[PDB]
Amino acid sequence: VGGLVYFSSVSEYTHRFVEKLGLPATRIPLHGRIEVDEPYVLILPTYGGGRATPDINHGGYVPKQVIAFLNNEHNRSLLRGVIAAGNTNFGAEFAYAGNVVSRKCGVPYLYRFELMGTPDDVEAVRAGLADFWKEQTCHLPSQL
Ligand SMILES: Cc1cc2nc3c(=O)[nH]c(=O)nc-3n(C[C@H](O)[C@H](O)[C@H](O)COP(=O)(O)O)c2cc1C
Ligand SMILES: O=S([O-])[O-]
Ligand SMILES: [O-][O-]
Ligand SMILES: [Cl-]
């Protein structure tokens, strides 16, 4: 099973989405450092915002705890993709933390959803993660 790491604030919407997924995951805490050991997709919500014509370098979209988690070189090395949450009322900033992580960390942006996600989002992410980890079996070392 693929690795999953997520962050969720007091509103618990990303936590609720992860619980609906039926896939195990590690939660980045409100404070404190953690470490992981195997490759993972990161699920994160978007904060900050308000800028109608945004830029991926304007700070505040990626939760500070996620930035700290990815400052650990080992954690960062194991990131393989990102899924982001937000609120489409933010328009050009919808789920922008996914844009920031994907572009600045150089990993694919797999999916995005609103708040705790719909049943269709849950199914799409389950299927998308299965396809994602299957594709890694096309990158195996030579045995010769
Ligand atoms: C202070 C604040 C700023 C937010 N900024 C954005 C934003 O820029 N873009 C976006 O799509 N959603 C934004 N949101 C919506 C959150 O990403 C959304 O509510 C998310 O589901 C919260 O996830 P969580 O409950 O796991 O923390 C913001 C929410 C808050 C409270
Ligand atoms: O409340 S959390 O986003 O620091
Ligand atoms: O920073 O990935
Ligand atoms: Cl809060």
Side-chain angles (χ1 to χ4, degrees):
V1 64
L4 268 181
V5 175
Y6 74 103
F7 180 81
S8 192
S9 78
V10 299
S11 43
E12 304 296 338
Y13 300 144
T14 311
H15 173 70
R16 176 65 181 142
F17 182 72
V18 169
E19 286 298 17
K20 291 188 296 185
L21 279 180
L23 292 168
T26 294
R27 185 173 185 168
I28 297 166
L30 177 80
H31 287 298
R33 305 169 272 180
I34 65 161
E35 262 215 340
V36 301
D37 277 333
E38 290 182 283
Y40 63 93
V41 168
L42 175 64
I43 305 180
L44 78 179
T46 305
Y47 305 131
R51 312 305 164 171
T53 312
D55 185 81
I56 56 158
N57 307 111
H58 170 85
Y61 296 110
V62 179
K64 61 183 175 188
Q65 296 90 344
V66 171
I67 298 172
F69 177 82
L70 297 171
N71 273 342
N72 177 301
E73 66 86 14
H74 187 213
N75 289 345
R76 185 171 66 249
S77 73
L78 289 163
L79 177 66
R80 296 287 173 274
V82 65
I83 294 172
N87 188 321
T88 61
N89 291 353
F90 280 90
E93 286 170 316
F94 171 52
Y96 210 62
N99 298 81
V100 178
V101 169
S102 174
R103 286 185 48 161
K104 295 311 295 191
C105 301
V107 297
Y109 191 179
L110 279 57
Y111 201 79
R112 65 190 178 194
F113 62 94
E114 277 200 293
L115 311 175
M116 56 312 282
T118 68
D120 294 329
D121 293 327
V122 170
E123 298 298 344
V125 168
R126 280 167 175 167
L129 293 170
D131 295 338
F132 181 82
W133 294 109
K134 184 163 197 162
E135 190 275 351
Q136 299 282 318
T137 73
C138 300
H139 293 260
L140 307 182
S142 179
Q143 299 188 98
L144 298 175

